[PDB]
From a paper:
Through the COVID-19 pandemic it gained more prominence by being a key pathogen in respiratory co-infections. This study will present a structural analysis of [name], [name]’s main virulence factor, an excreted serine protease. [name] is a member of the subtilases family defined by Siezen & Leunissen et al.. It shows the main structural and functional elements of the family, such as a reactive triad consisting of Asp42, His105, and Ser28922. The catalytic triad consisting of Asp42, His105, and Ser289 is located on top of β1 (Asp42), α4 (His105), and α10 (Ser289).
[name]’s 36 kDa structure, solved and analyzed by x-ray crystallography, shares structural similarities with other subtilases, first described by Wright et al. for subtilisin BPN’24. [name] has the subtilase-typical α/β fold formed by seven, instead of eight, parallel β-sheets with five α-helices surrounding the sheets where four helices are antiparallel to the sheets. Besides the seven parallel β-sheets forming the core, [name] shows only antiparallel β-sheet formations in β2/β3, β6/β8, and β11/β12, all located on the fringes of the structure and therefore supporting the structural stability in most loop-rich regions of the protein. The protein also has two disulfide bonds, Cys93 - Cys141 and Cys183 - Cys220. Cys93-Cys141 links the loop connecting β1 and α5 to a loop covering the catalytic triad, beginning directly behind β3 at Gly79 and going to Ser103 on top of α4. Thereby, it strengthens the connection of the loop to the core structure helping to form a kind of lid above the substrate binding cleft. This lid is a loop insertion, not present in subtilisin BPN’24 Proteinase K26 Thermitase27 or subtilisin Carlsberg28. The lid may facilitate and support two distinct functions, on the one hand, the lid may move to block the entry into the substrate binding cleft, thereby preventing unwanted binding to the catalytic triad. On the other hand, closing it also stabilizes potential substrates inside the substrate-binding cleft. The [name] protease exhibits some special and additional structural features, like a relatively high content of Glu and Asp residues and a relatively low content of Arg and Lys residues on the surface, which may give the enzyme the ability to be active in an alkaline environment.
Author numbering: 1 to 356
Amino acid sequence: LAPNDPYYQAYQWHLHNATGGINAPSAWDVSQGEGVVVAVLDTGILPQHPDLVGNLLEGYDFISDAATSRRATNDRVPGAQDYGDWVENDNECYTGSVAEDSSWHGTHVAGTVAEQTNNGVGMAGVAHKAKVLPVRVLGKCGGYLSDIADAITWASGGTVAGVPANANPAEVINMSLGGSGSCDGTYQDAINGAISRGTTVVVAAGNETDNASKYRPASCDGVVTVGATRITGGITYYSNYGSRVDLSGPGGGGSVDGNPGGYVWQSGSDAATTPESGSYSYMGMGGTSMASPHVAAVAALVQSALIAAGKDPLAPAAMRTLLKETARPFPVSIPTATPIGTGIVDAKAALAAALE
Ligand SMILES: [Ca+2]
C-alpha cells in the first residue's frame, strides 16, 4: 500500500526506506491492526488532532500530582489530554536540567502507532486501523513510578483501586519512557500482571548511550526492549545497548542525518506551553521513544491479522520471539560491545511468519 498522506513520501523514511524502514507498505497489504487496542503510556494526547481523530479511545490520566499533571487536583481522572510538560526554568527537574518547551511526546508516539493513514492529511501511522488507548503518566519533569505501574495494570485489564474497570483492555502496551535503576519489584509485578493477561509490553531502551540493564523499564523481565537505528540502518549515537535489547526500530539519528532523515515524523503541535499556545502540526523527533512504537504497532498488526483469520493471538513470549526472529539484520555493522538486538523490526516478515 502506498498511502496518499501528503507528507508520507518525503518525510517518513522510517516507514518505507529500504535500509532504515520497517517495511510498512508491504505489511499494510496484509493488516492495518483493525480490532486491536494499543495502550500508549506517555505524556497524554491531543485528542482532537485532525490526523488522529477516529483512532483514539478516551483513556485516563494516572498522574497523581497536580504540579506534574497541571490539573486542579492530585486525583487521577478520565481522559488523557496532555496539558503540556514544559518547564519554564533551569534546574526545576534536577540539577543542571534545562528549561524546555512542551514535547507533545505522547501525541507523536500515538501517531507512530495509529495516525490516520491514506486520508489525504499529514502523515501515516503503522497500525492505522487499530485504536490507541492513551494513558497519561508523564507531565512536568516526568512521572511517578507508582503511577506508571498502576497504568500498566489498568491498561492490560487489571484492577486498580479508585479507577473504573478498563472496558478496552490492551493487547499491546507501549512505554516510550525510562529512568535510571534496574527493574524493581513494583514495576516487575505490574509487568508480570500485564503478561499474565496476554498483553505484550514494548519499551524504549533509553537514550544514554549506555547498557540498557541499568535503566527501567528497559531492564525488566518479560518485556520487548527496543533500541534505535538511523535511516542508514546503523545504531544511533544515543541508543542504549546490551544483551537486554531485543531488536531495534527506527529512532532517527539526529542532526548527522539531516532533515528529514534524522527524525521520525508524526502528529504533534508547535505549542510551547499549554495546548492553546500553539496549533496542530507534524513534528520530527528522535529517540528510542520513536523506535518503540514502531515495534508496538507491528505487534498490533500481527495480533489483528491472526484474529482476522480466526487464529489464536500470540502469547507475550511468542510475540517477542516472533519479532526478534523476523527482524531484518542490520545493513551496517553493529559494534560487538553495543548490541541492539537481532535486527530492525520488519512488519511484513513478522506477519508472514505469524500467518504461516
Ligand atoms: Ca494522515
